[PDB]
Amino acid sequence: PSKKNGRSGPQPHKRWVFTLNNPSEDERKKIRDLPISLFDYFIVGEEGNEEGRTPHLQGFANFVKKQTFNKVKWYLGARCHIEKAKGTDQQNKEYCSKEGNLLMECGAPRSQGQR
Numbered sequence: 001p002s003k004k005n006g007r008s009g010p011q012p013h014k015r016w017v018f019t020l021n022n023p024s025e026d027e028r029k030k031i032r033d034l035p036i037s038l039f040d041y042f043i044v045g046e047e048g049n050e051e052g053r054t055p056h057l058q059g060f061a062n063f064v065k066k067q068t069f070n071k072v073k074w075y076l077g078a079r080c081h082i083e084k085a086k087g088t089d090q091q092n093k094e095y096c097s098k099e100g101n102l103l104m105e106c107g108a109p110r111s112q113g114q115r
Contacts, residue, residue: 012068020080022054032104040064041107047099060085060092062110
């Protein structure tokens with residue numbers, strides 16, 4: 001299996017989020033047991049405040065380096081849906097905490113800069 005990568009259309013970034021429905025103890029443990037040094041910022045939150053329904057995983061991780069969607073799947077796995085994050089450090093940190101339940105708290109408050 002050979003694949004070609006470059007800078008066409010979508011490009012790699014230092015910010016990627018992950019979301020999976022009805023997360024298992026194994027999957028949640030894997031991501032929660034991930035290398036903190038690998039991501040300057042790591043924030044995971046659990047969302048499950050509805051009886052009769054299963055829990056859901058929702059968190060954000062800032063890649064210390066530049067990685068692509070397909071590549072990032074090497075850690076976040078294909079099982080869990082990943083997407084590009086947007087906003088400031090508080091926007092991402094608060095967004096994950098919006099669930100009211102924290103699954104993992106590590107890394108530093110990575111914010112954007114441009115002005």
